[PDB]
Tab-separated table of N, CA and C and ligand atoms in Angstrom:
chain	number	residue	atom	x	y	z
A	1	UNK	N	176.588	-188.150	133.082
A	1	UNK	CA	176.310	-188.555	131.664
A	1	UNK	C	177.584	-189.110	131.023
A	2	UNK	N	177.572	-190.393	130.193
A	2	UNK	CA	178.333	-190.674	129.437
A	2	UNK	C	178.420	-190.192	127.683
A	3	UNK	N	179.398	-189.359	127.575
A	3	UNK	CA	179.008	-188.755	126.166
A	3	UNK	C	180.035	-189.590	125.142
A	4	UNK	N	179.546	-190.042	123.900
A	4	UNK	CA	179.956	-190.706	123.005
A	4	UNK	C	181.339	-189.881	122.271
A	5	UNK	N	181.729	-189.980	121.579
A	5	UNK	CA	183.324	-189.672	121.326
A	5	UNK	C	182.673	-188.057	120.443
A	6	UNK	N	182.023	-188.716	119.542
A	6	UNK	CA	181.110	-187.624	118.222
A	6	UNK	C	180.214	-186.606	119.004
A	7	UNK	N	179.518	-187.027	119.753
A	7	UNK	CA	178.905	-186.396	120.632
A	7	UNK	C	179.672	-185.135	121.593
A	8	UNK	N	180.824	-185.297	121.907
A	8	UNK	CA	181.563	-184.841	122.833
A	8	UNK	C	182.454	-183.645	122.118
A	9	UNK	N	182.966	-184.051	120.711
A	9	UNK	CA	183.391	-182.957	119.677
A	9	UNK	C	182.919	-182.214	120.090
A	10	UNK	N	181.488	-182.566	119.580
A	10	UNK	CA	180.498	-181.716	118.789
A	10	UNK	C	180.513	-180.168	119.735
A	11	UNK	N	179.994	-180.630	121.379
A	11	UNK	CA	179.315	-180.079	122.368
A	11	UNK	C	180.909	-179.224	122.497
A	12	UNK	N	182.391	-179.658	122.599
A	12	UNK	CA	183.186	-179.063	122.757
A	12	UNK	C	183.745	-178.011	121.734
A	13	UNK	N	183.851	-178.093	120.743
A	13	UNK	CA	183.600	-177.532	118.982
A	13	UNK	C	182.484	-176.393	119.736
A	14	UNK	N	181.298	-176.424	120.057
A	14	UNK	CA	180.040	-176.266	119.880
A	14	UNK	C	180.207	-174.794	120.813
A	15	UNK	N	181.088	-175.156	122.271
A	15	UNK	CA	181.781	-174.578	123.362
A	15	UNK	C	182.847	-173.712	123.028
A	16	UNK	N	183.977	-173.725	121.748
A	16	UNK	CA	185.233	-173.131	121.442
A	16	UNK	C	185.813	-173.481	121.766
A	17	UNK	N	186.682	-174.658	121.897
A	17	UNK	CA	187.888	-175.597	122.748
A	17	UNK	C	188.305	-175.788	120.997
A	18	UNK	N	187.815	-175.815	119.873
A	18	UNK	CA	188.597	-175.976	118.635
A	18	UNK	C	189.500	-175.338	117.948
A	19	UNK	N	190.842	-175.401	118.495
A	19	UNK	CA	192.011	-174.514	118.342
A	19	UNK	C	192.286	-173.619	119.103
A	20	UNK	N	191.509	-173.210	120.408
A	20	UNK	CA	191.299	-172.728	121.434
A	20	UNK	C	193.069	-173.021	122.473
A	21	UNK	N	193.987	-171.640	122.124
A	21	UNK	CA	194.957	-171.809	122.220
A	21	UNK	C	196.242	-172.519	121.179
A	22	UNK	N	195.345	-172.932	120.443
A	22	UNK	CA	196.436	-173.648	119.196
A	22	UNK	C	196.362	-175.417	119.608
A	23	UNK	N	195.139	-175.945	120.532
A	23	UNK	CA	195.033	-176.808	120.869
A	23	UNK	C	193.747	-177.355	119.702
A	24	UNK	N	193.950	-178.324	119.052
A	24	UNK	CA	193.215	-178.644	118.027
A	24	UNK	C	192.194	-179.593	118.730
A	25	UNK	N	190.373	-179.798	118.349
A	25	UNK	CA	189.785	-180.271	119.009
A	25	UNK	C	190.005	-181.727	119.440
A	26	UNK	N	190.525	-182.466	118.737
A	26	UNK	CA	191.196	-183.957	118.608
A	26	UNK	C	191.709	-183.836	119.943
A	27	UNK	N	193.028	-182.994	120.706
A	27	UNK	CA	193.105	-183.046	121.871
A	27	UNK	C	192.593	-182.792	123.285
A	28	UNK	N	191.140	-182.404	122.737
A	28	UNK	CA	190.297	-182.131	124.127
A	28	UNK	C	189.623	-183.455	124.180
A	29	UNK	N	189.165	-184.385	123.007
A	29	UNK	CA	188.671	-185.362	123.228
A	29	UNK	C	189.486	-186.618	123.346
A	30	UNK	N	190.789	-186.395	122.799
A	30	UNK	CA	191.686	-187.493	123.659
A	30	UNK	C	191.917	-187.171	125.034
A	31	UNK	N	191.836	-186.224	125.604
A	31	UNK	CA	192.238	-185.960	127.098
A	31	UNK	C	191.207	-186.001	128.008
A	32	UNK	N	189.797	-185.975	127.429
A	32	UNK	CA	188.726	-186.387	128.029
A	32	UNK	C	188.383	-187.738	128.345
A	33	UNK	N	188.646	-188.467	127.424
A	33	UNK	CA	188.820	-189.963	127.146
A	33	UNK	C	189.544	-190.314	127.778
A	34	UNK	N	190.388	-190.322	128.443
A	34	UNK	CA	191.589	-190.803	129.208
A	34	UNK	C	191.442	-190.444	130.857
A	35	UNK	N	190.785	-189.139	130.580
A	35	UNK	CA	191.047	-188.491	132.099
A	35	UNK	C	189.625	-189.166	132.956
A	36	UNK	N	188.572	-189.323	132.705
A	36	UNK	CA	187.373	-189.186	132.778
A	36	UNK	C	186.798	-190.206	131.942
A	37	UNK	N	187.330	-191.100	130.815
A	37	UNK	CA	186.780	-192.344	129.609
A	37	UNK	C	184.999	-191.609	129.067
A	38	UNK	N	185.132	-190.033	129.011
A	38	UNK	CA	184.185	-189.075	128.749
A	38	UNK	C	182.724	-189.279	130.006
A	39	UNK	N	183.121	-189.716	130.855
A	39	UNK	CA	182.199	-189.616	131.978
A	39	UNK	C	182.051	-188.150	132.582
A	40	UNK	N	180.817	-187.140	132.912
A	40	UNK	CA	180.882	-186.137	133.555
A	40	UNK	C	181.334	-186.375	134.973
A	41	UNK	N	180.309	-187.490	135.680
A	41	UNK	CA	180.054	-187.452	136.952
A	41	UNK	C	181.580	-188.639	137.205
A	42	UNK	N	182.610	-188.459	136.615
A	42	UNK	CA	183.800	-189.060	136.967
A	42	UNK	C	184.365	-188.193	138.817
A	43	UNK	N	184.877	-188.837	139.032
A	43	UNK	CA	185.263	-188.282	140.960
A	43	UNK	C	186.780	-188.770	141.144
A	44	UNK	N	187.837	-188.294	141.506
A	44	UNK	CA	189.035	-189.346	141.925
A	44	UNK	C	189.493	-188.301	142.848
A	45	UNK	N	189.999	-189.064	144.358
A	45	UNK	CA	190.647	-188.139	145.174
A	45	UNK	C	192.306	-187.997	145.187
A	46	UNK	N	192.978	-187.021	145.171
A	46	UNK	CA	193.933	-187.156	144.930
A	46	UNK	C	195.346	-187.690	146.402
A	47	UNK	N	196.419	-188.054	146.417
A	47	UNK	CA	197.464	-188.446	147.443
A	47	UNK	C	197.247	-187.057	148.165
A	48	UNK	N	197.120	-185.612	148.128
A	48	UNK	CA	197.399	-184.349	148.460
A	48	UNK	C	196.035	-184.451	149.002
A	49	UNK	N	194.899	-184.996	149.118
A	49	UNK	CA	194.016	-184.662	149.752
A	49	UNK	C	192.705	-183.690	148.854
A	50	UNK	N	193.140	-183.354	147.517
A	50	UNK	CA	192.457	-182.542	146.742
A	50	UNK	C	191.964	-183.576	145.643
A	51	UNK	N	190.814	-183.086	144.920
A	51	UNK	CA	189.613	-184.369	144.498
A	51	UNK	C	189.976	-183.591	142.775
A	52	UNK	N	189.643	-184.779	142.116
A	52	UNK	CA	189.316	-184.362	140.925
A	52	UNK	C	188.381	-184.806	140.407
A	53	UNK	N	187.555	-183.404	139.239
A	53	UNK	CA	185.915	-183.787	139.142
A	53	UNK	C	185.456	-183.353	137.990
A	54	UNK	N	184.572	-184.362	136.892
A	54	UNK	CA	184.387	-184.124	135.584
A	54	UNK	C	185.170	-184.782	134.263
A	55	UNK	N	184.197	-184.185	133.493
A	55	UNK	CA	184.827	-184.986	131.868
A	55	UNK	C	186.398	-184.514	131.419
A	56	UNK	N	187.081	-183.455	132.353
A	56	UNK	CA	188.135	-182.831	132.209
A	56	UNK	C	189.427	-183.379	133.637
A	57	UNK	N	188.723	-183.745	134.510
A	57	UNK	CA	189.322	-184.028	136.170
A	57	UNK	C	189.622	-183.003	136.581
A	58	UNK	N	189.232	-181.592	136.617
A	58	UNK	CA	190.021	-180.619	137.225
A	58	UNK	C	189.942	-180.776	138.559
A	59	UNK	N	190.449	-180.410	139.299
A	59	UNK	CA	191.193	-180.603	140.528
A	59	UNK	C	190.853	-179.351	141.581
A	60	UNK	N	190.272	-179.429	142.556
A	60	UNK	CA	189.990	-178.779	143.538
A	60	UNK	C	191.230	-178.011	144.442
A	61	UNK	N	192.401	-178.012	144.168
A	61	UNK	CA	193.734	-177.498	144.809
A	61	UNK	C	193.756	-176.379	144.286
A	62	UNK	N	193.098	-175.656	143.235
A	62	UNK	CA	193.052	-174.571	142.600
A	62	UNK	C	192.166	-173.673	142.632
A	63	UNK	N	191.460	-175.435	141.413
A	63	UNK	CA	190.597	-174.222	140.395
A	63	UNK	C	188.799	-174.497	140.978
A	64	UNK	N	188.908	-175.180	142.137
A	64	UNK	CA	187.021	-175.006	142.641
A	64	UNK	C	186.886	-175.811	143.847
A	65	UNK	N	185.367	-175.249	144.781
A	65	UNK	CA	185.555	-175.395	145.591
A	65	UNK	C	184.818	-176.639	146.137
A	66	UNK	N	185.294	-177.833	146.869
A	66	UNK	CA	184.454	-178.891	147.219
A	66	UNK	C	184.593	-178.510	148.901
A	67	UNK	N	184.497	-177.721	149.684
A	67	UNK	CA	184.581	-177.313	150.907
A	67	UNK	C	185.401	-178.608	152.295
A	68	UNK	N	186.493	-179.282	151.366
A	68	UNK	CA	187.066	-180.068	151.996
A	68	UNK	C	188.982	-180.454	151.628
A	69	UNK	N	189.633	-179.086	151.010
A	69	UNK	CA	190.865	-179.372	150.466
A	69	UNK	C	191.230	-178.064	151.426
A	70	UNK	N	191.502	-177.997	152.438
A	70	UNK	CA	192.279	-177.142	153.214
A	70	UNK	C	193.486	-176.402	152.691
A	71	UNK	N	193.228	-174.790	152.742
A	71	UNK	CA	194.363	-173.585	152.051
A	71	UNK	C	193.832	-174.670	150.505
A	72	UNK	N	193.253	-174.246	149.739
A	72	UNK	CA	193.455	-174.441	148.469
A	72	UNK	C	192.593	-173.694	147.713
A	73	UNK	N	192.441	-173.113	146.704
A	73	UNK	CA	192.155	-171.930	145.318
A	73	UNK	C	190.846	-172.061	145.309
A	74	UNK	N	190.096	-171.116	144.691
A	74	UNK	CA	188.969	-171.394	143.515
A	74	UNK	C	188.761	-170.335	142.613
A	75	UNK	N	190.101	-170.397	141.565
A	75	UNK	CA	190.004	-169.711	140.671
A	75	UNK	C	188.894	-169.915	139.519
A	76	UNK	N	188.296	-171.070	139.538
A	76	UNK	CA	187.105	-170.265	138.582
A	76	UNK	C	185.609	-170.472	139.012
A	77	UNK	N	185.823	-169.697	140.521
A	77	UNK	CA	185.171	-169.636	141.391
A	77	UNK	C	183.428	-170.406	141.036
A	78	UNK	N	183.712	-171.670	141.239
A	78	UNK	CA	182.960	-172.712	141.076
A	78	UNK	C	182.879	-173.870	142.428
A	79	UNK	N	181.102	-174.293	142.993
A	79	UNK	CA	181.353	-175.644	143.283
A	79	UNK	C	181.886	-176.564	142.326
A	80	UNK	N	183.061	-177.627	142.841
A	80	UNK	CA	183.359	-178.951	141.925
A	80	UNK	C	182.068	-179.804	141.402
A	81	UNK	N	180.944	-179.869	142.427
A	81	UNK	CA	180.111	-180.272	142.151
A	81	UNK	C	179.608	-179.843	140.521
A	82	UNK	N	179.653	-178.282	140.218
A	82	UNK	CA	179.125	-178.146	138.778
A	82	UNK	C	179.555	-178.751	137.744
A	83	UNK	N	181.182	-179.207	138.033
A	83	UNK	CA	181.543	-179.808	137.061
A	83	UNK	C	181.764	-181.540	136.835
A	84	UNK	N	180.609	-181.453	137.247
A	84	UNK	CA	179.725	-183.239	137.241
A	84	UNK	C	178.712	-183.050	136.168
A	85	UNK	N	178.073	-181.743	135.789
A	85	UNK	CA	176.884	-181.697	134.861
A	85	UNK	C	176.679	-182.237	133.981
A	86	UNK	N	175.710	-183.347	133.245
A	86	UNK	CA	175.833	-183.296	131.933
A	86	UNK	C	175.995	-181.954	131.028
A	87	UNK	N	175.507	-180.869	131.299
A	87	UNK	CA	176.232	-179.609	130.459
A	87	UNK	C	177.788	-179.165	130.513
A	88	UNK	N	178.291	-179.413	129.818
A	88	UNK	CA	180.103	-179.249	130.102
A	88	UNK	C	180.510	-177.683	130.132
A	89	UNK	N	179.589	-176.499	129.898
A	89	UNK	CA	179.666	-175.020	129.641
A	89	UNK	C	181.261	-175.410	131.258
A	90	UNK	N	180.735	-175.639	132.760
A	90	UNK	CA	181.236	-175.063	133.717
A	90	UNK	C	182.681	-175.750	133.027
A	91	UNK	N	182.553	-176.762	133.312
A	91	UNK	CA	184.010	-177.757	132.970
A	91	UNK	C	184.659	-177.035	131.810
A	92	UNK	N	184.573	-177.053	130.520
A	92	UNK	CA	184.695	-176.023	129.520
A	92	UNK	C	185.586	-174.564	129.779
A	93	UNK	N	184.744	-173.758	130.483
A	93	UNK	CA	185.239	-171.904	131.273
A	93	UNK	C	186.648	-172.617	131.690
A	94	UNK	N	186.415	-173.627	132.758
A	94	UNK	CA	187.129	-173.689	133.625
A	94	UNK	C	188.231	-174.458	133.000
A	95	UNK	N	188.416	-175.157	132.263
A	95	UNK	CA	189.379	-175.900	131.043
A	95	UNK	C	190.111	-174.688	130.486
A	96	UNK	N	190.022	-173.948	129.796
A	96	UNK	CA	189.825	-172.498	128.989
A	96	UNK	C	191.023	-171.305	130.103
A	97	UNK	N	190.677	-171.507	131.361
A	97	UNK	CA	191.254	-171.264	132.328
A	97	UNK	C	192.720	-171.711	132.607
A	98	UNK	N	192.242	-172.877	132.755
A	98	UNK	CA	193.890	-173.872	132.877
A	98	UNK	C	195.000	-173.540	131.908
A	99	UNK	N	194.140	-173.856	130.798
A	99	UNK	CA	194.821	-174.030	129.255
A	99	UNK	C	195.599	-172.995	129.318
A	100	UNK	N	195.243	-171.696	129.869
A	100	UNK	CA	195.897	-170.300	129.388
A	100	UNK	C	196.519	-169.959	130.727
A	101	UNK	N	196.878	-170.616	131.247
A	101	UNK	CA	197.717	-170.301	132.610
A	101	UNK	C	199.093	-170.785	132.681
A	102	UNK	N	199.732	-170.897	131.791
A	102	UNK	CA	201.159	-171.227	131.353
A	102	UNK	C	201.546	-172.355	130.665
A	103	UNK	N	201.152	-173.347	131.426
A	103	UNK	CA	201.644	-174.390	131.065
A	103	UNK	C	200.585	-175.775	129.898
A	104	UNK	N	199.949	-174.780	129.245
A	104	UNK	CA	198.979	-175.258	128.102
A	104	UNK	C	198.064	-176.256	128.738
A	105	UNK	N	198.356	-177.675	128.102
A	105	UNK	CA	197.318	-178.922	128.229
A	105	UNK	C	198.202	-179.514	128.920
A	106	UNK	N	199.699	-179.055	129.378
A	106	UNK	CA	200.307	-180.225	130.223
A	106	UNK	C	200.121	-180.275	131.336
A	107	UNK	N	198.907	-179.392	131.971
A	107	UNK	CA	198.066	-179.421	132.962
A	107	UNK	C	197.229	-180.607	133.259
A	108	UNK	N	197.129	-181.202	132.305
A	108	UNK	CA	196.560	-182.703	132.233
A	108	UNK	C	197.771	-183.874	132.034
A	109	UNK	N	197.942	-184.343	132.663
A	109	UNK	CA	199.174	-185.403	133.117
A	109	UNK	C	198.407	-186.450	131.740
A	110	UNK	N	197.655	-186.806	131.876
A	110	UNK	CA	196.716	-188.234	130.808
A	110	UNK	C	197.104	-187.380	129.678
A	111	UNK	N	197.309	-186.269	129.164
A	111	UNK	CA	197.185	-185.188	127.369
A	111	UNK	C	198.630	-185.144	127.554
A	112	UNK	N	199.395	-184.688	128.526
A	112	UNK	CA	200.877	-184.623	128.225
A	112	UNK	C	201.439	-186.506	128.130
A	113	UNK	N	201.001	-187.949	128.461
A	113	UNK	CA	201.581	-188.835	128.823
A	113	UNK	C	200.965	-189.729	127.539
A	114	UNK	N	199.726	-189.250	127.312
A	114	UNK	CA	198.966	-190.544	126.204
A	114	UNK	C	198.311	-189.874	124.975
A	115	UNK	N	198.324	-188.074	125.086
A	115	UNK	CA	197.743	-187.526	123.358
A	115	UNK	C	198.638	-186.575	123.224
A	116	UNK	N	199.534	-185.818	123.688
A	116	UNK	CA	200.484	-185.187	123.322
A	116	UNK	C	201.537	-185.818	122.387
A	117	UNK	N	201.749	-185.275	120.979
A	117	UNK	CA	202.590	-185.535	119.544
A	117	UNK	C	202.083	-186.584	119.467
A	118	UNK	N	200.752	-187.232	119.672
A	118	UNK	CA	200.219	-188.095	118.594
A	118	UNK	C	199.191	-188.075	117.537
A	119	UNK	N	198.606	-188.868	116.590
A	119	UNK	CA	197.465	-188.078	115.858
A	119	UNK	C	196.112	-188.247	116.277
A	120	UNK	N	195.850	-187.085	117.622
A	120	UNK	CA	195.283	-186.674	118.203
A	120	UNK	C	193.432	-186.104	117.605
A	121	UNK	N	193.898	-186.125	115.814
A	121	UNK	CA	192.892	-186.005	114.765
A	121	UNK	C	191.769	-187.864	114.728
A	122	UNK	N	192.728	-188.331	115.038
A	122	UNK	CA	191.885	-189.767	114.508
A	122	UNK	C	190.864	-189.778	115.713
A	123	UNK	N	190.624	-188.562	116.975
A	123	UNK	CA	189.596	-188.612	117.634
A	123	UNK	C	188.192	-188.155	117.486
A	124	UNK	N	188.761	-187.242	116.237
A	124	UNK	CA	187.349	-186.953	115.200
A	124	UNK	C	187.147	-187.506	114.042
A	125	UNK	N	187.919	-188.261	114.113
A	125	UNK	CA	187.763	-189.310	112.288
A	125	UNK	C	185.976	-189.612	112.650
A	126	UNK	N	185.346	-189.005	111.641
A	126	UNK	CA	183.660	-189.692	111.014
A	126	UNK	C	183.013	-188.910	111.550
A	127	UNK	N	183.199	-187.768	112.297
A	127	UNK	CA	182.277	-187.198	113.072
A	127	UNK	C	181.327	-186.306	112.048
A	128	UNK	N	180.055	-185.815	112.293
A	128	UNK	CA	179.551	-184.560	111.960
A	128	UNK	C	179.770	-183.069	112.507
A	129	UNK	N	180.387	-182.529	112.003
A	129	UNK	CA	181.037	-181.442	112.898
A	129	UNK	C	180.551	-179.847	112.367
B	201	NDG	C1	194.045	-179.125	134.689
B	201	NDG	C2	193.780	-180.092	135.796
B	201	NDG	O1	193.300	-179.740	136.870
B	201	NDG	N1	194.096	-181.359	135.543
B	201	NDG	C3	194.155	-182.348	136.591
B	201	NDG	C4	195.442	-182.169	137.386
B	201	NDG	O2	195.472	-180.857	137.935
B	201	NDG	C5	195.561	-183.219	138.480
B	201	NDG	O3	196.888	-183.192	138.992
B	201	NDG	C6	195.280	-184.610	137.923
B	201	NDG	C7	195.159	-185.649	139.007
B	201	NDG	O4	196.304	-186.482	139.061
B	201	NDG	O5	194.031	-184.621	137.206
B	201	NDG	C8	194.052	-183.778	136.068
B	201	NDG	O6	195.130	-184.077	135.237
B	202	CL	CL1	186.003	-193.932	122.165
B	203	CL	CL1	192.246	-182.635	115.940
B	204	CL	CL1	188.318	-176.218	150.707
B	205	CL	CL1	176.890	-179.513	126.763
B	206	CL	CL1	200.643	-173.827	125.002
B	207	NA	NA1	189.354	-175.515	146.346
């Protein structure tokens, strides 16, 4: 599913990603937008051999399992496949996860390089929220 910018707040707002860590919702939907251009069923394989999957790209070296990244995690013990859904709940947990594992949103290379210290708010300018 392709979810519209307003649309994508909403469902993330809707989820608890709004200030969720001191991360204001403006930066889940700039980092979605960038990582994914808010596509669920987004796919990219990585140089390391580990895939990234969803409106978030999380990455199979960790955090789920696509039964093809040899010695690698599944801390939020998930197929990657779930996080293709149009329902973002799995992608979401598993975001929520990252976020609070030290190193915040700079877990996302696209949020630390293109929405990190910018006004990350003009991604909800007009929305219904
Ligand atoms: C939190 C998370 O998994 N984000 C991933 C990152 O791990 C991976 O390195 C990158 C691919 O280059 O895609 C996303 O940024
Ligand atoms: Cl947009
Ligand atoms: Cl914001
Ligand atoms: Cl694997
Ligand atoms: Cl949803
Ligand atoms: Cl942080
Ligand atoms: Na894995």
């Amino acid at each position: 599913k392709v979810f519209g910018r307003c649309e994508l707040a909403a469902a993330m707002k809707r989820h608890g990603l709004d200030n969720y860590r001191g991360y204001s919702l403006g930066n889940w939907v700039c980092a979605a937008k960038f990582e994914s251009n808010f596509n669920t069923q987004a796919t990219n394989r990585n140089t390391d051999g580990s895939t990234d999957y969803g409106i978030l790209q999380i990455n199979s070296r960790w955090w789920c399992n696509d039964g093809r990244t040899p010695g690698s995690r599944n801390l939020c013990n998930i197929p990657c496949s779930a996080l293709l859904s149009s329902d973002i709940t799995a992608s979401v947990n598993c975001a929520k996860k990252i976020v609070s594992d030290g190193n915040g949103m700079n877990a996302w290379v696209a949020w630390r390089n293109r929405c990190k210290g910018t006004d990350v708010q003009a991604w909800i300018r007009g929305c219904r929220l």
